[PDB]
Amino acid sequence: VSTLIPPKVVSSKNIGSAPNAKRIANVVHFYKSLPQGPAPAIKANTRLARYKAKYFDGDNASGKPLWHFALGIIAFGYSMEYYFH
Amino acid sequence: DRIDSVSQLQNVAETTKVLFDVSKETVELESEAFELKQKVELAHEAKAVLDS
Amino acid sequence: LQSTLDNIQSARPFDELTVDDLTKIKPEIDAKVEEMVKKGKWDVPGYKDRFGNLNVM
């Protein structure tokens, strides 16, 4: 009876579609995300900070700390098993 | 994917206005020869009677 | 949406993002964990699909 007009009705149509739900999701997931590894806090300073940078960081993550623990028992020979039970 | 979906109708909506415009006249501008149709059919019967 | 593409290309902390930063970016990530424990849904699926359970032998 006349010229129908569904070419321009997306101003209220862009709310119910599924991609819009993902659209409003990931845009919030993007703006505050740190750009290039910023704010990594690589300078750890808490009590034994030196340990935090050699083995406690996790780059090595090997049996050295338990080796250090074992050597501590060895150095305590005349303190726990000798001169005492 | 939503870049493409938005870019599908970046140029369409304003170009549909002249589309919506002209389509209105091209549909509803058929009345002048509709009256000419009234006189064209008037001519045929005028020819018909005299041929008769 | 074009700025979103420029946003994502140079803001990808896929190796240095903080989960507490994910708490900051969405309180829903924070919100969805508390009522998980209270309502009793202690078990959490949806992990073995991406990472193997890493079972020792």
Side-chain angles (χ1 to χ4, degrees), chain A residues 1-22 24-35 37-41 44 47-85, chain B, chain C residues 1-5 7 9-57:
Chain A
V1 298
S2 172
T3 62
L4 208 67
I5 185 171
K8 53 188 78 181
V9 177
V10 307
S11 61
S12 58
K13 184 258 171 188
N14 292 319
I15 59 170
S17 77
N20 298 136
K22 288 177 66 65
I24 65 171
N26 44 24
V27 297
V28 188
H29 289 97
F30 290 164
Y31 64 92
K32 182 265 290 180
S33 59
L34 61 83
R47 327 187 203 273
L48 295 177
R50 281 83 59 198
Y51 289 77
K52 266 308 293 198
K54 50 188 67 150
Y55 298 104
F56 289 180
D57 190 7
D59 195 4
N60 166 68
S62 309
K64 305 295 188 291
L66 65 94
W67 182 69
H68 313 330
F69 289 169
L71 265 293
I73 307 300
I74 301 156
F76 291 164
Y78 283 75
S79 285
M80 191 36 48
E81 85 260 24
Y82 310 140
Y83 303 164
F84 190 68
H85 302 90
Chain B
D1 192 3
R2 299 185 270 265
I3 301 299
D4 295 318
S5 73
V6 172
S7 68
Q8 289 295 321
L9 72 164
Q10 54 175 359
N11 200 7
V12 182
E14 75 278 26
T15 57
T16 58
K17 274 294 304 171
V18 295
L19 191 163
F20 198 81
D21 186 74
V22 175
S23 48
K24 283 296 288 182
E25 292 91 7
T26 55
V27 169
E28 290 103 5
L29 273 186
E30 75 284 35
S31 296
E32 61 277 353
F34 166 75
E35 307 307 332
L36 174 74
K37 155 176 304 310
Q38 186 67 41
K39 79 178 51 56
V40 168
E41 68 91 21
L42 191 77
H44 300 308
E45 55 186 357
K47 295 184 287 290
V49 292
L50 185 42
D51 281 316
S52 176
Chain C
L1 266 72
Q2 211 291 323
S3 174
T4 308
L5 188 153
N7 189 179
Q9 49 87 25
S10 63
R12 206 186 171 123
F14 67 98
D15 188 75
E16 59 269 12
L17 183 63
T18 309
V19 297
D20 296 328
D21 208 6
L22 287 161
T23 288
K24 288 187 281 183
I25 191 166
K26 305 285 197 302
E28 187 263 335
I29 311 309
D30 201 6
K32 78 173 291 182
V33 179
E34 292 100 13
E35 96 285 21
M36 183 278 288
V37 171
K38 263 73 75 176
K39 85 176 180 286
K41 208 183 96 176
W42 191 90
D43 53 343
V44 190
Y47 172 50
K48 276 72 61 183
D49 47 354
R50 321 221 177 162
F51 292 170
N53 64 7
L54 191 152
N55 190 351
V56 180
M57 295 296 172

